[PDB]
Design a protein around this ligand. Structure first.
Ligand SMILES: N=C(N)NCCC[C@H](NC(=O)[C@@H](N)Cc1ccccc1)C(=O)Nc1ccc2ccccc2c1
Ligand SMILES: N=C(N)NCCC[C@H](NC(=O)[C@@H](N)Cc1ccccc1)C(=O)Nc1ccc2ccccc2c1
Lengths: 150, 150, 150, 48, 400, 50, 50
């Protein structure tokens, strides 16, 4: 910075502390009362919600091996398993509505081969609906899966 | 739509090679159609004003809202928006020994907003009770305050 | 460093007059904080292309970029796609080789944050802490000792 | 005549009252295609 | 009874579901610090950990960042509940968990912490609830907009009235430390006004100087001051700016310390200043009535004050305006299609009054239980018109 | 439709005008559209009746 | 440049909004070619120069 009269050197360390710290101390997060950071990813106004969340793990997976000692990843606030439960509970409802249609078709018609045409009727119509949604732009949403139930 | 993007993403490459006067002025890449349609005159009858007071109110209330509304190409104000206008007398500069350079420097010093920090900073000391933002220099408002620039 | 009033007319208002002549658009809103962070929101019509809408907003702000402070220019101006709500929040903690809530936030923003925002069309990432930076804490008493300023 | 006309959506409820029709409208016309084709076929082929 | 069970049946848009993940925001009073709000975020973390071990798996607190905006007053805790299997009853589901969080903390404590389920929905679509905003359409400032906003909030809760619940968004209003630098005193002793502005600017607020390299990458370099020399208003005089005549000069010489009243958040809507009002409908009224009885209160205020509805809501709602027109063409196309394969002026009318046959049953099941007329119910109606049309067309086709 | 929304934004501005400030309309293409529809649909009904 | 043609100096605030600030000269001192000599630029040795 300077050199005072008598050949004495003034340095930046002499006039000021020097610590390698954060650029912004306005926010500091915790995790169950433990010092931590994170990554709050937000959608891109038209992104593919779950496929984007699957590729969040794709990039993260190549980062894992080169971590320092102790550095571990945790997952609070995650919408991924709510998609996996809505598909697992609507497709469970799908198979339950077919098996109970079978019991009503056996009570009225005691013929086993008679309770078979309607059993192999609606499975064909459900698959065909997936083909029309792909050709129009719609996706497997919460609405076009409850629509398969109704 | 796409034609407007490429023209204004190429001009921008040669923006640094222009005078600093033109940079702070209004460069604009709009959609053109040589011909007006809706021309909205603005006059006065009762509380009479000039052809200058009217053009300011048109460009400080309804012009910013019109160009934004229903995809307007480009608006042409019929007059001018108000502005702190200064008419330097050359005889009164030589009297007190001065130039136009000294007048411009006085406005770019006193007439300016500075970014002061804040009491109770972003990295504070543990146990601080208050936290407020510091105000320093403020931009001038009226004709009277511009006349008292030293 | 700028307070609420400072950013309200030096950054905010400058963009708002130059936020005109855009295809579509219902309204505009804004929030100018005392911390020194402005954020505008141009909400367009339903079923509008988010791709082309991002181009026109960031090719109009850029016209009024030279009319801003030189502090804000070198800072991070950003036009991203927004969706008020997170989905995948990836916490990052330590167990074995213990470190602070500052060492962790640097490694998150110098290895995995740059890769996440780029991957599978992410709108905008919010780092929970801050990236490292050569931080200097100027002692005022040690400046007056050797006759100096910031 | 009740699904598709109700599927003339408006606003934020664009793909809400839309998708809860057209999705099942494809299911209706494919059940009409499965009731005009294939269901007649297997009824004659094998039943009693 | 079909008309009576429809109008009395209330209107939602989409049911608020158990998502297995919710959150709770914090808000401290005027000019709070980072250390003060950290005490509040610790007490919130206790309720979810020690007093709720069975329902909660992990908390993720964040000091100084609410969804309102930013600052060291706010906070937020991203809760992450255990899986659905380990939470059996209605007590262990989101609705009951956040219920004994509000009226418990509210009343006790000192700050304001809520907790709330995540809207499946979007930001909009609460139903029986609006979002107003008041504009400054003339030359009056922010100080005069504050008085007009307090008169709108006052008269709203002055006469309820088939009530109307109303609060501001967040213009709390806190004091700011103004520093008047006299320009004649500065130049007299010989200090440049440039030097003074980047002394106060690059110490208290910080300054972006240059870029450097740390461990391969490239980061930033900042300059400010040790914490203790910029906490109180008396520490401004500790800084000494140098003058042209090689000698130190304190800040107290040319400065003038004095407090003021500003606002920490100046909102502006559509090129003009504004103040957001987050109101709501009564348990009696619902949306349409609450909005038109807030417009005649908005036009009863002083000159240069108008309004504009900001700002997620709406563009023709669903239970109302839309629904009528959708069902109207549903009758015009049903009538025409029952005729293309029949040829009469009597057959189609038989199917055109099985509409109320099946509908009364749908209204009975929803109104009996705790359900309401939402999206899932309104499409369950049109499906029952297709099932009542089916059965009745068999009664009309085989019989003719 | 753009010229109709020019009046939409202008209509909210009208109430907050100073004393004497009034709006006038020279050079306007709006009524030429309204006459071309009123004269073609008049021609339409005349060709049916004849 | 900042007398005859004008010069964009800085921005200020008028009645809430933000406008511009210009600098030029009274009308009479920049009409004719003989009025160029009326301006005097200062030199480093503290004295006027036409
Ligand atoms: N209005 C809606 N819902 N869709 C319009 C699509 C336009 C056109 N397809 C069509 O125009 C047909 N849907 C129209 C039609 C054809 C034949 C009979 C009836 C209707 C078509 O381009 N289809 C799609 C579908 C999905 C897409 C997804 C991403 C990108 C492009 C896409 C294009
Ligand atoms: N930004 C702020 N502060 N509030 C917006 C919240 C929107 C809305 N609730 C309300 O607007 C209520 N505050 C209105 C009210 C109800 C009863 C008494 C007074 C005010 C809401 O959706 N949820 C609730 C419900 C009840 C509340 C009671 C107090 C405080 C916040 C509340 C939030």
């Amino acid at each position: 910075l300077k050199v005072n009269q008598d050949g004495s050197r003034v340095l930046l360390r002499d006039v000021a502390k020097i610590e390698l710290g954060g650029e912004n101390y306005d926010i500091i997060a915790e995790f169950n009362g433990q010092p931590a950071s994170g990554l709050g990813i937000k959608l891109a106004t038209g992104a593919n919600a779950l496929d984007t969340a699957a590729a969040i793990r794709a990039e993260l997976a190549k980062m894992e091996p080169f971590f320092p000692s102790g550095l571990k990843i945790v997952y609070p606030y995650d919408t991924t398993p709510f998609v996996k439960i809505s598909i697992h509970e609507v497709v469970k409802t799908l198979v339950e509505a077919i098996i109970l249609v079978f019991l009503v078709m056996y009570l009225f018609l005691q013929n086993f081969r008679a309770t078979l045409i309607p059993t192999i009727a609606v499975p064909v119509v459900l698959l065909g609906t997936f083909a029309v949604l792909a050709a129009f732009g719609f996706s497997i949403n919460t609405l076009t899966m409850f629509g398969m139930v109704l | 739509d796409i034609a407007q993007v490429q023209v204004q993403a190429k001009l921008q490459l040669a923006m640094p090679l222009l005078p600093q006067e033109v940079q702070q002025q209004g460069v604009s890449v709009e959609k053109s159609s040589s011909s007006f349609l809706m021309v909205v005159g603005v006059i006065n009858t009762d509380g009479t004003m000039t052809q200058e007071d009217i053009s300011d109110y048109v460009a400080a209330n309804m012009k910013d809202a019109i160009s934004r509304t229903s995809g307007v190409g480009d608006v042409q104000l019929f007059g001018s928006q108000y502005a702190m206008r200064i008419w330097m007398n050359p005889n009164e500069l030589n009297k007190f020994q001065l130039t136009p350079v000294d007048v411009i420097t006085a406005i770019k010093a006193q007439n300016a907003q500075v970014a002061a920090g804040q009491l109770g900073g972003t990295p504070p000391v543990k146990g601080q009770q208050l936290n407020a933002s510091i105000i320093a220099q403020t931009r001038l408002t009226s004709t009277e305050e511009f006349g008292k620039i030293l | 460093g700028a307070d609420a009033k400072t950013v309200q007319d030096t950054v905010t208002q400058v963009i708002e007059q130059n936020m005109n002549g855009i295809d579509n658009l219902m309204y505009m809103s804004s929030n100018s904080d005392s911390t020194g962070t402005v954020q505008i929101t141009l909400t367009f019509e339903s079923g509008t292309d988010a791709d082309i809408a991002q181009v026109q907003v960031q090719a109009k702000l850029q016209l009024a970029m030279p009319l801003l402070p030189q502090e804000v220019q070198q800072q991070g101006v950003s036009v991203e796609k927004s969706s008020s709500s997170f989905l995948m929040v990836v916490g990052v903690i330590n167990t074995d080789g213990t470190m602070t809530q500052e060492d962790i936030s640097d490694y998150v923003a110098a290895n995995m944050k740059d890769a996440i925002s780029r991957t599978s069309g992410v709108g905008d990432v919010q780092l929970f802490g801050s990236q490292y930076a050569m931080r200097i804490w100027m002692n005022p008493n040690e400046l007056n000792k050797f006759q100096l300023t910031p | 005549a009740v699904f598709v006309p109700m599927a003339f959506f408006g606003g934020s409820t664009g793909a809400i009252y839309r998708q809860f029709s057209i999705t099942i409208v494809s299911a209706m016309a494919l059940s009409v295609l499965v009731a005009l084709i294939l269901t007649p076929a297997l009824c004659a082929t094998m039943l009693k | 009874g079909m008309a009576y069970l429809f109008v009395r049946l209330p209107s939602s848009f989409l049911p608020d579901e158990d998502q297995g993940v919710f959150m709770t925001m914090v808000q401290l009073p005027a000019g709070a610090t980072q250390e003060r709000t950290q005490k509040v975020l610790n007490e919130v973390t206790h309720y979810y950990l020690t007093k709720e071990k069975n329902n909660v798996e992990s908390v993720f607190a964040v000091n100084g960042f609410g969804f309102a905006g930013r600052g060291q007053n706010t906070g937020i805790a991203f809760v992450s509940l255990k899986d659905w299997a380990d939470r059996p009853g209605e007590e262990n589901k989101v609705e009951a968990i956040t219920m004994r969080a509000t009226r418990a903390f509210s009343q006790i404590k000192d700050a304001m912490v809520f907790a709330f389920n995540l809207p499946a929905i979007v930001e909009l679509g609460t139903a029986t609830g609006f979002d107003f905003e008041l504009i400054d359409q003339a030359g009056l400032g922010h100080e005069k907009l504050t008085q007009a906003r307090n008169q709108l909030l006052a008269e709203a809760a002055k006469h309820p009235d088939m009530l109307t619940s109303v609060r501001p968004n967040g213009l709390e209003d806190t004091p700011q430390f103004k520093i008047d630098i006299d320009q004649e005193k500065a130049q007299a002793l010989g200090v440049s006004i440039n030097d003074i502005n980047t002394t106060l600017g690059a110490a208290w607020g910080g300054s972006y100087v240059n870029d450097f390299i740390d461990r391969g990458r490239v980061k930033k370099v900042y300059v400010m001051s040790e914490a203790k020399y910029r906490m109180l208003p008396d520490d401004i005089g500790d800084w000494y700016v140098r003058a042209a005549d090689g000698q130190m000069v304190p800040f107290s010489a040319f400065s003038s310390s004095r407090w003021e009243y500003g606002s920490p958040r100046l909102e502006r809507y559509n090129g003009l200043p504004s103040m957001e009002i987050l109101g709501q409908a009564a348990p009696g009224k619902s949306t349409g009535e609450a909005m038109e009885l807030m417009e005649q209160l908005a036009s009863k205020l002083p000159t240069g004050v108008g309004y504009d509805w900001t700002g997620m809501s709406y563009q023709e709602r669903l239970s109302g305006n839309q629904a009528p027109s959708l069902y109207a063409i549903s009758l015009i196309v049903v009538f025409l299609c029952l005729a293309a394969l029949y040829e009469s002026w009597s057959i189609p009318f038989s199917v055109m009054l099985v509409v109320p046959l099946g509908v009364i049953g749908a209204l009975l099941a929803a109104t009996f239980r705790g359900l309401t007329n939402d999206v899932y119910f309104q499409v369950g109606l049109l499906t029952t018109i297709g099932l009542s049309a089916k059965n009745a067309i068999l009664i009309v086709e085989f019989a003719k």
